[PDB]
Amino acid sequence: VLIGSSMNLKDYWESGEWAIIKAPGYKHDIKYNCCEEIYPDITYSLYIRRLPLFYTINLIIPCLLISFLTVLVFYLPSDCGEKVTLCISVLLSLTVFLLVITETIPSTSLVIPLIGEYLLFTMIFVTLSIVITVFVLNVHYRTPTTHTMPSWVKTVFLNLLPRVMFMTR
Amino acid sequence: SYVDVTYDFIIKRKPLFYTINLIIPCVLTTLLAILVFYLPSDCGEKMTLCISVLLALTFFLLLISKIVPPTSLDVPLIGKYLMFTMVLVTFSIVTSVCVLNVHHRSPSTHTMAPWVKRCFLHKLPTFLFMKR
Amino acid sequence: LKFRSWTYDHTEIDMVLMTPTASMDDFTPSGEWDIVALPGRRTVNPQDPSYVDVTYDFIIKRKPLFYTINLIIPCVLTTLLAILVFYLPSDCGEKMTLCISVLLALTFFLLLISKIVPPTSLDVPLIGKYLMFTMVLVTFSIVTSVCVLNVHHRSPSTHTMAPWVKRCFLHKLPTFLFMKR
Amino acid sequence: LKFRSWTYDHTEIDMVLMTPTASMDDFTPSGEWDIVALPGRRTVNPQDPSYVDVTYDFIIKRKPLFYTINLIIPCVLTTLLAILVFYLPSDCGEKMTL
Amino acid sequence: LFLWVFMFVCVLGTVGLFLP
Ligand SMILES: *[C@@H]1O[C@H](CO)[C@@H](O[C@@H]2O[C@H](CO)[C@@H](O[C@@H]3O[C@H](CO[C@H]4O[C@H](CO)[C@@H](O)[C@H](O)[C@@H]4O)[C@@H](O)[C@H](O[C@H]4O[C@H](CO)[C@@H](O)[C@H](O)[C@@H]4O)[C@@H]3O)[C@H](O)[C@H]2NC(C)=O)[C@H](O)[C@H]1NC(C)=O
Ligand code: NA
Numbered sequence: 001v002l003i004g005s006s007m008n009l010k011d012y013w014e015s016g017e018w019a020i021i022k023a024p025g026y027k028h029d030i031k032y033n034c035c036e037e038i039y040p041d042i043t044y045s046l047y048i049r050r051l052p053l054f055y056t057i058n059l060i061i062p063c064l065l066i067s068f069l070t071v072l073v074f075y076l077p078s079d080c081g082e083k084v085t086l087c088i089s090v091l092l093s094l095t096v097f098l099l100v101i102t103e104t105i106p107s108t109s110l111v112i113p114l115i116g117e118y119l120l121f122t123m124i125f126v127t128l129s130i131v132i133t134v135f136v137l138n139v140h141y142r143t144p145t146t147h148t149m150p151s152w153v154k155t156v157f158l159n160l161l162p163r164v165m166f167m168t169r
Numbered sequence: 170s171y172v173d174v175t176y177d178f179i180i181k182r183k184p185l186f187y188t189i190n191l192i193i194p195c196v197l198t199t200l201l202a203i204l205v206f207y208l209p210s211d212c213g214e215k216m217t218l219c220i221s222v223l224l225a226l227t228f229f230l231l232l233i234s235k236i237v238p239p240t241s242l243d244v245p246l247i248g249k250y251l252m253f254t255m256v257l258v259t260f261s262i263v264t265s266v267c268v269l270n271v272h273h274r275s276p277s278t279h280t281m282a283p284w285v286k287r288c289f290l291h292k293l294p295t296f297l298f299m300k301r
Numbered sequence: 302l303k304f305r306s307w308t309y310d311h312t313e314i315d316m317v318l319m320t321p322t323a324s325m326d327d328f329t330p331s332g333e334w335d336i337v338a339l340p341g342r343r344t345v346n347p348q349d350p351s352y353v354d355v356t357y358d359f360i361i362k363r364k365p366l367f368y369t370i371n372l373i374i375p376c377v378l379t380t381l382l383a384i385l386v387f388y389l390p391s392d393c394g395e396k397m398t399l400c401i402s403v404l405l406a407l408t409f410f411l412l413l414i415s416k417i418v419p420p421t422s423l424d425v426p427l428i429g430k431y432l433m434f435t436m437v438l439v440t441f442s443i444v445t446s447v448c449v450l451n452v453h454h455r456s457p458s459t460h461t462m463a464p465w466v467k468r469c470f471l472h473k474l475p476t477f478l479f480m481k482r
Numbered sequence: 483l484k485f486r487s488w489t490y491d492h493t494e495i496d497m498v499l500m501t502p503t504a505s506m507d508d509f510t511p512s513g514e515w516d517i518v519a520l521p522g523r524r525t526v527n528p529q530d531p532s533y534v535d536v537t538y539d540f541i542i543k544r545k546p547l548f549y550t551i552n553l554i555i556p557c558v559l560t561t562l563l564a565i566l567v568f569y570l571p572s573d574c575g576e577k578m579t580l
Numbered sequence: 581l582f583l584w585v586f587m588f589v590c591v592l593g594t595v596g597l598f599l600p
Contacts, residue, residue, distance in 0.1 A: 054234075
């Protein structure tokens with residue numbers, strides 16, 4: 001027989017990390033497959049919430065702040081030689097944050113976190129950004145004494161698109 | 170039917186260990202945060218210094234988030250300070266890329282507008298003590 | 302799991318397995334692993350009395366989506382980035398950075414995968430062998446990239462172009478590789 | 483391994499070794515090490531009574547592959563690039579990086 | 581030349597390892 005209807009939180013020493021909302025208790029009379037008789041039990045159910053300030057100031061704001069740097073590569077000119085270093089640095093920093101987030105969470109394969117999905121998404125697109133920037137660096141450093149420029153690239157990549165992108169030479 | 174006796178140890182901390190080992194490289198890299206703008210844009214070393222300062226600040230932030238307890242009741246002044254300086258370094262990176270792009274503009278690609286003719290050559294160089 | 306007694310032996314007690322399979326009645330699903338079959342057998346050695354044993358075998362499958370989505374995709378990612386330092390032109394100065402960074406990421410994932418694995422020498426997993434192969438390939442890529450970057454910076458004032466590179470790397474091979482000047 | 487009895491001594495009990503080696507009739511191979519010999523011997527000091535001793539020596543050999551795949555291939559791999567910085571030209575500024 | 585060579589060697593390596 002339960003005395004009350006909830007767990008006592010009268011002598012509860014405060015945690016500082018998890019806040020208890022409610023903790024009810026429910027009596028059941030269940031029957032197991034070993035044995036031909038009914039056994040009773042009492043189930044308590046803590047319903048807690050994380051206070052999200054220690055992790056959003058040390059794991060989410062730097063992660064978001066470096067994931068907003070994977071698109072900033074393409075405004076940097078190819079005459080300089082720093083298109084790669086930035087991409088390599090943000091790739092390795094996302095890899096280190098992926099190590100941190102697979103250190104913090106369990107290995108339950110039921111569902112995936114949104115933050116790990118966002119990290120995987122940003123790593124895929126920053127890898128596609130380096131495979132684009134190596135192509136534009138190969139297109140840039142190219143001379144007429146080694147390569148002949150085709151005819152269809154004169155109309156598409158030089159006349160059709162700058163009228164759309166508002167460049168106009 | 171409730172009595173107890175409570176003693177209250179109030180303890181002050183000797184700060185000389187973490188002042189030398191953590192506060193000095195913190196204020197060192199913070200002193201280096203405002204330093205990437207005096208470097209000329211012709212040498213290809215603007216991005217290395219910016220990314221290096223940002224990665225050192227993220228290293229010290231993940232270092233200071235380990236000796237501290239993981240309580241969300243309050244954040245220390247060092248964590249808030251490194252978050253502020255990290256936002257400042259990220260804004261330094263975006264304005265360094267955007268001021269490095271306007272360094273390599275040629276007449277065969279771009280054309281100088283009349284407002285950037287009349288603004289960034291007469292008013293502000295006499296305002297910022299440049300004097301040609 | 303090997304259940305047997307330390308006091309008594311086969312000359313004083315039997316040990317009869319009742320059901321062939323262990324029951325699965327109050328089982329809560331683990332979420333990470335999957336029980337697929339639970340057989341059980343009773344082992345006794347003829348011409349060796351005083352031996353009783355009841356062993357239960359647990360054959361366990363893994364739900365593999367976690368280690369897939371966190372390690373297999375960056376593995377094939379950094380492997381796909383390894384045949385890529387050759388399309389980058391040597392006129393820029395960013396080849397050795399890319400080569401050293403790919404080798405660095407491969408050594409990082411190798412030391413990470415050597416942590417979740419047990420330290421046994423029966424056999425290495427296929428991820429460690431695959432990364433070892435790709436790491437040796439990236440090291441050969443570094444040494445041939447330095448060798449192919451030396452011939453880019455050869456001036457006429459300090460070097461003399463031999464006739465064999467004239468007859469080999471200018472006429473036959475630019476037609477063999479569809480270059481054509 | 484030095485077996486001895488704290489309570490008694492050589493003036494009270496002897497300690498005779500029965501078989502010269504240790505029995506490997508229940509050993510399961512660990513897959514990380516290899517036992518190769520397990521000799522035992524009895525140790526007694528003349529001109530120093532009340533000292534019995536039975537010492538077992540475990541002579542073990544390591545399975546060499548796990549540390550070869552992890553701490554030898556990168557060790558012999560990053561050593562080969564040390565004398566490689568001299569063949570690189572000094573015009574492309576990538577010697578200090580390597 | 582070395583791009584094609586290392587691409588071919590890497591494809592044969594992946595096939596020969598992950599054949600089963
Ligand atoms: C966290 O996770 C836990 C476990 O997964 C959840 O706990 C369950 O919560 C539900 C919802 O309250 C519980 O269901 C309730 O069970 C009570 C006990 O059952 C006894 O009484 C009934 C009725 O006679 C018998 O049939 C039974 O055999 C038991 O003897 C019921 O009394 C409740 O019924 C009341 O609510 C319903 C509406 O839900 C009304 O229609 C009824 O008239 C009545 O007022 C209710 O059915 C369940 O028992 C809990 N599980 C366990 C193991 O205890 C938590 O809910 C979850 N947290 C959150 C926030 O969801
Ligand atoms: Na560089």
